[PDB]
Design a protein around this nucleic acid. Structure first.
Lengths: 401, 902, 405
DNA sequence: GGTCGTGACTGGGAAAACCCTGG
DNA sequence: CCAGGGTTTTCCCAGTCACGACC
């Protein structure tokens, strides 16, 4: 497993996962209690979130995404206690044993909890969104965000995992049809951006009440990890969330009024981010190059400069940077590197960073028309004019699918 | 007691059962004959072995309608064939009216008398019909034109879309666009297609209309083998049909008269040849069992539902995903080769060192920030203005290796995708990028001499080419399906597919993506070869109004969807031996997770309230060959050592010939089965040599030839274990008319030894066994129909896949149906005994190991068909309950030996 | 007086059109202000997402020295906001009354000293990542980190509000210059979209520690409310987080290496969202026409869809094709043609304006004839005809022209 | 054995280009 | 110096060759 650690030192060096080597342990990164990611890691999370938002909300008509509050308020994982009230209680020396016990019991019985499962948010907003969709069924409410989980440490700890969830309220007649359809669509989404989607697997699980859902995994170099889960929870949770009459809790399917149903998805995006990291690097002369797919790689264009007329070269590079930024691409402003590093070392750094193309602006650009362009996929040079080059890049992104 | 044995102390039929079947009289071999048999079996060394007695059967069998068994079965077959025999006699005396002068453009059926006058008719009701349909593939799966000559008047069937102009109807397919035709018999050329167009063979209740195929009787009388017809076509050498397919609907409405004249001429000529050869079909098939079994076989029925739709659509979609992955894998390898350019490292690689790599040269306050940005952008656009130079035609990626440009799409073309998107699996750069290894040595391609391998030996062998002066490595040509005289194309070939399975071609370097496209190709081989066939099936979706009330009253009916049928368009007599040969359905394939979409059988599932009873006729042809050898040796069971091995043989104990041959030669199980089958089929010594050459190549020509000679000296003896069967077949071939031992039905006249003499023996050697199998299946279906008509048991013939037989039954009679099958098998073996003069029958041979009862079609009731295209399986995606297996003791315990409902 | 009633009518629209969700009892001005609301609706989620996108385009995109960071929602212990508590342990401890008063207080303290915290600002993650980022950028001061995300604060309950935080590690010499630059850019960016830029009031301020900064306010009818703040930090924070070698915390301008001053730009997003919701509300002439005229760069959904009279299937096909074409071009839409029980055309226009849809698109059989569709504007409600092959380019041009101006 | 797929070899009028030249 | 002629030089549609699924 040296290559797994050799990837980890690259993922630490070139600003993907924040921290030091001591906390660079498998359980720390896999358990959601990670010490943070780098800036490129945050942009990779944003790219994954953008692709999920296209796949789920943009290209599906009935998905109206919703946002529920971060903490679940009491009465009733973990509990929260304010510092000011604790200070007031502790500073009151006149308090006896019984009053402190009563205060502690009240706190334990009136504590909000940081959320774990986002199903309750949709179960809260369902009536309002039923008013929204003009009672058109099926539909669903989506959301991405960080959830809070206990850490079962063998040595208390809170692990933060970013989760994208959607509660597809469906008619009960066509429940498993939608379940199979969503399994196919989301497994296609998790297989769309991979070097080897054979490592992405699929298995089915059965709930205690007879409900059946599917589980997805990734063949890591040390065993599978759960990357998404599905559970068609029926209608027990929604009925439990609104006791009484079922006048509000209903809907229309075609011409038949029916009680809705519950489907769920739980996508640990951080787990998938590390999974795609392990998918990019696959373990003659070795070339330590991260082969991220050309839609999720965090920085696309690399722009540099050579020795010479630094005023005019810097003007050209700054203009090119602003021109590309106006067209939505992201460039790494490497032209300010006065500390002259070799093109071999610069390319090695920019190829560990999973950058799509490296654009080299030499004096010959100021001579006639030519800029160098080296592709990460081929590591072979090319010449281009500036005026064409922009469009090349954008169609490359448009050709990701 | 009931237990009894032969003089060879093998457990024979029970005394009560033998008395019930044979009637009276027990026999025994002659003293000199039995002494010769004892000495011969002592010579082979298999004499003197124990045999654990199986429990006997004490069952009051149903009475036989006839003192002679063969005469009673002949009377039963005559009773079955009597309405169809009368209809065929009417077709013999059928009068052909002259050509009508007009052909009306009416929907459905139109009658034209001797004067050709137009008569509006709905359902023509002739007892005998001669039919030919015209299929309009340009309008989906809907045929258009059908003819029916008759003793009374001409009948024309025009489709609904023919009269109407274009017009929009319901999607998918329904029998409403099909022909709505006392029992009736339709005889014609490819009446399977007509049955696919005839509505009357789609309900689960069954019908009484049957079909005789002039293709089938034509192959029975005057047919040709593959090589004989190929040589006849080669020696023979030295427009409406194509137009009708491309006619859409308007052009079909345009050239109507000439096409109708062609159809009338074809119907008339086929009817003339048919009525000439119908006495030939009668005398060449003297048993009415032939006619009854063919009529039962030609009405094969398969039930399907919406889930089969999934097995179509998803599988193709699944293939797309797999196809995508394959392309991606290839591209990855291509990218790797770019790095090999560095420092001319590609001048050292064993695989990628003979391509076009050389580089191509190139031819020829806020105001402060606002002002700075505007000036910088203006300078940028002024540099963009430098466009009045460089070649207007761009160079297609100079500097890269030239072959990488050759794999790349040109920049101007709108079908542009990143990377080498033009690369396919069959390019000449695909194997070199895969770094393929042929058992420790790399591959090598030449346009001069195909593909081979380079071995670092120059400074054993397989096709030496000393002309190829590769430095340091001798070049030996890769083996081919047609020897060393031919050249192999792309190494990803079908014939190289078994060589792909046993690790004769692996990549090695690049351990993930190197040997991954190989696995993808070996997975998608089946669906890539058969997707056109499977997508071309004409599924007909049954309306609920004519559906049986058994499923309608049952709560298990799916009201949201519909059901349907697939009619196997299988040629019943489509071989020289008239074996049921069809490349799509009856192929010997089973569902695996390593063939894409290999659950083709798995969607043949029973409707609610119904089930399928399957009998796997185990060692059918093996026992036929063994009993021919035993009958020609001494006319008993186990006369030869091979016959005793057939009687006393267990795969678990290894007492078969398969384990002995595996020890002796050293080949796989399938290789041993193929070798023993071909030797049974009549493989010659060159056939054995090429069969050994096709298998593992750890030997040479001389060693394989010596092993084949040693193997030939054992089984056939000095020609031993099985040569009595060979002498029996030679005695059959010595006669003027080659008559089968089982039925005497003569093969087609191409294999008569009058103009062939002692030639083409292997085809007839296979033909005797396969015609015996045809008689076996016909007798099994005849006995099932007779017991259904005798004990009022429901059911329908589902399919007869070569060896196995599946019957579509209702649920409540399942065990009863299974019981009938057991007795049927006994009678079948008994009939073989009664067609070989045998005076006894073994206990174990007459009974199958088990009979399966299931709600879905599969080989065994333990496999759920886990495939890439059905990843969850039937137990999760479809929730199908697994089947059950029964033995004769279990069936007797469940049914108490009762012949009626309790 | 009537302005508050109109605001409540806007909130009732927000309940009806699912910008802000809740109840009429929850419709309290300070409950909106602090963050005691049960949460905005989906259209409000789209409004916040567009506002966050505009911020991210403003700050992190067009700067070569500003990088994105993401501080966790918790700070681990032992530490010096509420306190994170694992419940089961506390319940088990509370099950015992044998321990005396002193023991109970002592163990409460013992738990308290090892208790993580939900965060208050976004500073401390960037402050911890300063060493890594200084190693990354090779000390070319100034350089910045940024984060948009939620933060929890106590209300005399716990309320979560999404804020935007920019941390500027600058040389001490250029401190006032970069402060003035960021203040001017921030004020212009907040004045960029609103109808009345004079309402955004910026005031300089200094704290008790002599820490200079600025405050931005928007004028609700009930007075001024805070939108964004700027502050200095000095240099004791980096030493407090990283005591020891100061040259390891040194950044370089020219050749001079100094401990960098830290500047904070922290701004509320949801309160400004409420302010822009008030800003877009107008009454155009007992009840006038309520128009929610959001800026095109910040409106939730741009172009809706309607059907005419004639073929149901063909009009649905045309609307679906236009929906997909706008999906590929990336313009937010509203496929709300599915209502069988349709209201009046004036009522349909009022309903689509209540969703603050920019333009209303109507498709008739004349679209099947020639490709023209009816297009209604928002402010002037003018109805025109435009061909189906250029409406996406026209809307792209409207968005880009609003962005350029 | 014969037929219709796919992909390699090539090859000739042509579109642009380069060198030289008439006036 | 500006358009035209002789020679280059690929270039791209098209033909021509081979072998692997099918009949």
């Amino acid at each position: 497993g040296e290559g797994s650690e050799a990837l980890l030192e690259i993922c630490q060096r070139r600003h993907f996962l924040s921290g030091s080597k001591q906390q660079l342990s498998r359980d720390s990164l896999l358990s959601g209690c990670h010490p943070g990611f780098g800036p490129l890691g945050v942009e990779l999370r944003k790219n994954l979130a953008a692709e999920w938002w296209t796949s789920v909300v943009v290209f599906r008509e009935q998905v109206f995404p919703v946002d529920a509050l971060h903490h679940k308020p009491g009465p009733l994982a973990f509990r929260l206690v304010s510092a000011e009230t604790l200070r007031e209680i502790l500073q009151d020396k006149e308090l006896s044993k019984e009053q402190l016990v009563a205060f502690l019991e009240n706190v334990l019985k009136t504590s909000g909890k940081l959320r774990e499962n986002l199903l309750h948010g949709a179960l809260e907003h369902y009536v309002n969104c039923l008013d929204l969709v003009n009672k058109r069924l099926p539909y669903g409410l989506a959301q991405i965000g960080v959830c809070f989980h206990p850490v079962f440490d063998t040595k208390k700890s809170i692990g933060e995992k970013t989760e994208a969830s959607l509660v597809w309220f469906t008619p009960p007649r066509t429940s498993n049809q939608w379940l199979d359809f969503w399994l196919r669509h989301r497994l296609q989404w998790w297989r769309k951006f991979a070097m080897s989607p054979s490592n992405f697997s699929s298995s089915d699980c059965q709930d205690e009440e007879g409900r059946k859902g599917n589980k997805l995994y990734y063949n890591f170099p040390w065993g599978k990890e759960l990357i998404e889960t599905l559970w068609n929870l029926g209608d027990h949770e929604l009925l439990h969330m609104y006791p009484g009459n079922v006048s509000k809790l209903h809907g229309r399917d075609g011409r038949k009024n029916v009680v809705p149903c519950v489907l769920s998805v739980n996508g640990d995006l951080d787990r998938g981010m590390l999974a795609y990291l392990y998918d990019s690097f696959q373990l003659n002369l070795h070339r330590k190059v991260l082969k991220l797919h050309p839609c999720l790689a965090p920085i696309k264009v690399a722009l540099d400069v050579g020795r010479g007329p630094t005023l005019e070269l810097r003007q050209v590079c700054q203009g090119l940077f602003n021109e590309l930024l106006e067209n939505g691409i992201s460039v790494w402003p490497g032209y300010l590197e006065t500390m002259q590093s070799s093109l071999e070392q610069l390319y090695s750094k920019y190829d560990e960073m999973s950058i799509l193309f490296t654009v080299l602006v030499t004096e010959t650009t100021l001579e006639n028309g030519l800029i160098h362009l080296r592709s990460r996929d081929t590591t072979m040079k090319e010449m281009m004019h500036i005026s064409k080059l922009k469009d090349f890049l954008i169609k490359y992104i448009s050709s990701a699918k | 007691g009931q237990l009894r044995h032969n003089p060879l102390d093998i457990q024979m039929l029970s005394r009560g059962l033998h008395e019930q079947i044979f009637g009276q009289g027990g026999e025994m071999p002659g003293e000199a004959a039995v002494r010769r048999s004892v000495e011969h079996l002592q010579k082979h060394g298999l004499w003197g072995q124990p045999a654990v007695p199986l429990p006997d059967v004490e069952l009051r069998l149903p009475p036989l309608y006839g003192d002679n068994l063969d005469q009673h079965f002949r009377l039963l077959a005559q009773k079955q064939s009597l309405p169809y025999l009368e209809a065929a006699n009417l077709l013999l005396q059928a009068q052909l009216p002259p050509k009508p002068p007009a052909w009306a453009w009416a929907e459905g059926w139109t009658r034209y008398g001797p004067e050709g006058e137009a008569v509006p008719v709905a359902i023509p009701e002739e007892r005998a019909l001669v039919f030919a349909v015209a299929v309009c593939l340009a309008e989906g799966t809907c045929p258009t034109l059908a003819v029916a000559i008759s003793p009374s008047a001409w009948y024309s069937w025009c489709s609904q879309r023919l009269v109407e102009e274009r017009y929009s109807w319901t999607s998918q397919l329904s029998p409403a666009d099909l022909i709505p035709l006392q029992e009736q018999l339709v005889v014609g050329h490819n009446v399977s297609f007509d049955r696919a167009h005839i509505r009357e063979q789609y309900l689960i209740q069954g019908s009484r209309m049957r079909f005789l195929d002039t293709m089938s009787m034509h192959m029975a009388i005057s047919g040709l083998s593959s090589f004989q017809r190929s040589l006849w076509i080669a020696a023979k050498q030295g427009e409406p049909r194509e137009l009708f397919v491309k006619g859409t609907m308007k052009d079909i409405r345009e050239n109507f008269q000439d096409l109708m004249q062609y159809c009338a001429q074809d119907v008339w000529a086929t009817h003339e040849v048919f009525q000439q050869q119908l006495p030939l079909f009668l005398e060449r098939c003297p048993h009415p069992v032939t006619l009854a079994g063919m009529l039962e076989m030609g009405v094969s029925y398969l039930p399907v539902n919406q889930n089969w739709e999934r097995y179509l659509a998803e599988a193709q979609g699944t293939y797309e995903e797999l196809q995508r992955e394959m392309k991606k894998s290839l591209m990855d390898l291509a990218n790797d080769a770019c790095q090999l350019l560095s420092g001319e490292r590609y001048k050292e690689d064993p695989w990628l060192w003979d391509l076009e790599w050389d580089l191509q040269e190139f031819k020829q306050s806020e105001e402060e920030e606002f002002q700075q940005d505007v000036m910088a952008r203006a300078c940028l656009q002024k540099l963009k203005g430098t466009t009045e130079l460089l070649p207007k035609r761009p160079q297609h990626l100079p500097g890269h290796p030239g072959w990488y440009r050759k794999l790349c799409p040109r920049l101007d073309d709108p079908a542009w995708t990143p990377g080498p998107s033009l690369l396919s699996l069959q390019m000449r750069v695909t194997p070199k990028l895969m770094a393929l290894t042929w058992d420790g040595f790399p591959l090598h391609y030449s346009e001069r001499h195909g593909w081979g391998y380079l071995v670092p030996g120059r400074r054993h062998g397989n096709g030496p080419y000393n002309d190829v002066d590769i430095p340091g490595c001798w070049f030996f040509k890769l083996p081919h399906k047609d020897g060393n005289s031919c050249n192999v194309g792309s190494p990803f070939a079908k014939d190289f597919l078994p060589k792909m399975e046993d690790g004769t071609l692996q990549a090695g370097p690049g351990g993930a993506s190197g040997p991954r496209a190989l696995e993808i190709n070996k997975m998608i081989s089946f669906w890539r070869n058969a997707h056109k066939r499977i997508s071309s099936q004409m599924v007909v979706w049954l309306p609920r109004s004519a559906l049986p009330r058994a499923v309608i009253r049952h709560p298990d009916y799916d009201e949201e969807g519909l059901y349907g049928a697939i009619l196997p368009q299988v040629v019943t007599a489509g071989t020289i031996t008239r074996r049921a040969v069809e490349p799509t359905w009856l192929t010997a394939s089973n569902a695996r997770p390593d063939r894409v979409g290999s659950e083709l059988k798995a969607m043949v599932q029973a409707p609610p309230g119904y089930t399928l009873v399957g009998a796997d006729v185990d060692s059918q042809e093996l026992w036929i060959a063994a009993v021919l050898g035993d009958a020609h040796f001494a006319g008993m069971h186990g006369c030869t050592a091979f016959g005793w091995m057939t009687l006393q043989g267990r795969k678990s104990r290894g007492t078969d010939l398969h384990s002995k041959t595996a020890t002796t030669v050293g080949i796989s199980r399938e290789h041993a089965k193929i070798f023993n089958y071909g030797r049974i089929y009549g493989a010659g010594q060159p056939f054995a040599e090429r069969l050994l050459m096709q298998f593992n190549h750890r030997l040479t020509q001389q060693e394989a030839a010596e092993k084949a000679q040693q193997m030939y000296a054992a089984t056939k003896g000095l020609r031993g274990t099985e040569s009595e069967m060979f002498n029996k077949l030679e005695s059959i071939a010595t006669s003027d008319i080659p008559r089968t031992p089982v039925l005497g039905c003569c093969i087609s006249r191409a294999l008569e030894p009058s103009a062939v003499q002692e030639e083409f023996m292997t085809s007839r050697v296979n033909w005797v066994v396969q015609s015996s199998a045809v008689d076996y299946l016909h007798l099994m279906l005849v006995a099932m129909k007779w017991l259904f008509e005798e004990f009022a048991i429901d059911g329908r013939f589902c399919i007869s896949i070569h060896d196995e037989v599946r019957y579509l039954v209702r649920e409540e009679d399942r065990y009863r149906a299974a019981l009938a099958l057991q007795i049927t098998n006994l009678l079948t073996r008994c009939m073989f005994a009664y067609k070989l003069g045998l005076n006894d029958l073994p206990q174990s041979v007459a009974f199958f190991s088990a009979v399966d009862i299931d709600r879905c079609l599969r080989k065994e009731v333990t496999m759920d068909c886990k495939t890439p295209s059905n990843p969850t399986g039937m137990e999760r995606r479809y929730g199908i309950p697994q089947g059950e297996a029964l033995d004769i003791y279990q069936i007797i315990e469940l049914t108490k030996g009762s012949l009626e409902k309790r």
